[PDB]
């Protein structure tokens, strides 16, 4: 009972290439990791073509991203707590000017996924 | 037996604010981590002031950073995989710019550490 991300992580590493130019400043793998199920719930699909839905889903991303932050600051992860909060102000940026085309890059992410997933190769 | 970083990571949380600005595209956490032990047994301070030891330090900090890619591959940790990668070809630009800036950089943010733990309150 694993999500998309457990999936990916089962694969064997080589795939881990194909996917670096999915991520950028809209979304950072610490993100697709941290928040894997949170992010495999939303349709950021639809989103994609819908101002107010994609303003609504980068507003959640960041509660949830705080929720994060609480956590790896209780764990005193220093690294992550250090590039959570980088990413945060990056993401606080794109709430303030285009959640339309983080819909787009997490849309095209998740979609890039899937592709690799049905390709990699798997015994019967 | 703990390094300096052992000693960071026992402070209470608050203080990694103040060493945010300490790390920038010549030096990123994900290097000072992994690489504690080895990062704290240069001369960084002698290098700031000496190209050829600067560009010597640099191709050896290039070298270790594979092998610590060759680990979290195996370990299959895929964020530290993706990211790591991306340092490497930032370091890479720094090899062929500036080796001497890097040390500067290295050299500040370990100093800066002392000084936030000769700072820390500790009772007695």
Redesign the interface.
Known sequence: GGSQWNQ??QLE?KF?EQ??QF?DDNFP??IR?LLAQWIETQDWEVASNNETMATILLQNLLIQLDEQLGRV?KE?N??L???L??IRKVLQGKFHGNPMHVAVVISNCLREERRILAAANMPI
Chains 1, 2 share one sequence.
């Open positions: 990916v992580q590493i881990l996917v670096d991520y793998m610490e990791h600051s005193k220093l690294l707590i250090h590039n909060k980088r």
